[PDB]
Amino acid sequence: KDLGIDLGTANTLVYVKGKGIVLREPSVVAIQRDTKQIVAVGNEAKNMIGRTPGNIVALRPMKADYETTATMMKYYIRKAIGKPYVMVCVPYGITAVEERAVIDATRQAGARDAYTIEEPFAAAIGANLPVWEPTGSMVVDIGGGTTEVAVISLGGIVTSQSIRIAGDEMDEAIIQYIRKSYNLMIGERTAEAIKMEIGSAGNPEGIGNMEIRGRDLLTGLPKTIEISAEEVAEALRDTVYAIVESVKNTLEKTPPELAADIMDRGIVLTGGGALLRNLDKVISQETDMPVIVAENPLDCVAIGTGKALDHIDLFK
Numbered sequence: 001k002d003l004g005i006d007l008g009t010a011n012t013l014v015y016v017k018g019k020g021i022v023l024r025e026p027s028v029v030a031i032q033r034d035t036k037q038i039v040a041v042g043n044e045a046k047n048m049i050g051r052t053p054g055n056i057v058a059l060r061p062m063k064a065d066y067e068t069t070a071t072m073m074k075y076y077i078r079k080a081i082g083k084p085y086v087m088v089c090v091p092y093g094i095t096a097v098e099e100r101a102v103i104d105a106t107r108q109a110g111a112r113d114a115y116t117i118e119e120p121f122a123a124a125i126g127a128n129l130p131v132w133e134p135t136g137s138m139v140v141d142i143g144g145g146t147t148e149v150a151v152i153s154l155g156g157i158v159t160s161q162s163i164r165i166a167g168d169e170m171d172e173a174i175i176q177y178i179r180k181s182y183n184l185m186i187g188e189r190t191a192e193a194i195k196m197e198i199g200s201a202g203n204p205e206g207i208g209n210m211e212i213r214g215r216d217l218l219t220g221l222p223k224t225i226e227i228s229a230e231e232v233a234e235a236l237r238d239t240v241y242a243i244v245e246s247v248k249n250t251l252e253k254t255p256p257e258l259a260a261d262i263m264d265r266g267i268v269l270t271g272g273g274a275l276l277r278n279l280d281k282v283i284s285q286e287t288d289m290p291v292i293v294a295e296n297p298l299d300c301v302a303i304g305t306g307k308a309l310d311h312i313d314l315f316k
């Protein structure tokens with residue numbers, strides 16, 4: 001059996017050729033404070049912390065100990081399943097020493113051999129763009145920690161860019177806007193809920209208002225206020241600008257013929273971050289190019305990592 005593993009910032013997905021996305025579990029680990037050892041991974045850690053055994057702490061490795069990686073991979077590989085060949089999705093900006101570290105750890109986790117794929121190429125394969133044709137295609141993968149842009153043609157990446165401004169950074173910007181605007185400190189969970197509920201990249205008209213709670217910075221005491229979609233859009237302006245610039249910087253680095261094909265096919269957005277309302281419209285208006293959101297934007301990467309198992313030669 002061959003496995004494709006997308007160990008995301010918050011969510012891990014395992015794909016087994018044949019069965020498809022067999023596993024969906026949080027990118028979470030549970031570590032004994034005293035033994036300083038990984039006691040559980042994924043749902044097992046969730047259950048552990050959920051049973052509250054004490055002396056356990058829960059951590060998300062996010063963006064890296066070779067041991068944490070190898071242990072995590074050991075759990076997801078065994079739970080999903082004579083040893084497997086594993087395609088591991090990696091961010092675009094990954095160095096070669098890091099990429100070798102992922103392979104050794106995956107090999108230590110129980111893989112015959114391991115191969116890596118850049119998230120943008122996987123996202124493109126999962127979103128059914130014609131990656132193998134000599135036509136140019138563009139994918140924008142906006143996750144939690146990273147936004148990654150790439151142009152693909154003939155089973156390779158022509159040009160690509162990565163930025164650390166993405167879904168998490170949208171939440172931060174909301175938190176910072178409310179800190180400055182209302183002298184109120186909200187947490188991550190509330191910031192995420194605001195982005196999901198009333199967040200938008202632009203045209204916040206009709207999105208609505210939300211009551212939120214946080215810590216007043218003068219008094220230290222909890223406080224409830226009303227936040228508008230208009231304000232949240234402003235709070236996300238610069239974050240959205242940054243994403244638009246990387247798309248434009250990638251086009252400026254694209255050959256004309258491929259740049260001309262993308263103007264016809266359009267740009268595909270993948271990743272949970274791409275669910276920010278009207279981001280597709282904003283990027284389209286600023287690029288003068290069709291922009292669409294992929295059909296299954298949260299599973300594209302994992303599906304692409306799974307389908308990449310059929311051309312394992314290329315990644316070998």
Ligand SMILES: Nc1nc2c(ncn2[C@@H]2O[C@H](COP(=O)(O)OP(=O)(O)OP(=O)(O)O)[C@@H](O)[C@H]2O)c(=O)[nH]1
Nearest residue numbers: 008009010011143144145146167271272273275276
């Ligand atoms: N605006 C908005 N964001 C969402 C929504 N649902 C999920 N997200 C965001 O999706 C992001 C993570 O989604 P994924 O595409 O799975 O990213 P990831 O694979 O876990 O992390 P990466 O490794 O960087 O790709 C988080 O930042 C979430 O806030 C939604 O409905 N609206």
